[PDB]
Amino acid sequence: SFHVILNKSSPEEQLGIKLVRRVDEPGVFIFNVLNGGVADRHGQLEENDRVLAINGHDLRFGSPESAAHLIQASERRVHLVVSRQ
């Protein structure tokens, strides 16, 4: 896995990532990265990347809804632990 740090300019700012679950395997996955958003401008994240944790909260067997809640909860810093096939 690897580390990605994204910073929100305001607490309600979205990262511009759509997350999905899959019927056939556990995990929270990147469906797409919105053009011009925080994640796109940072540049590292790719579609199909798996989000393993956000700010130290485990998402290996978690849900996109939990991910959204955790991303919102941070005032600014969003530390993602990510894996890529």
Binding site: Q14, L15, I17, K18, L19, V20, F31, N32, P64, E65, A67, A68, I71, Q72
Partner: peptide
């Protein structure tokens, strides 16, 4: 999908 869930937007974050």
């Amino acid at each position: 999908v869930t937007l974050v």
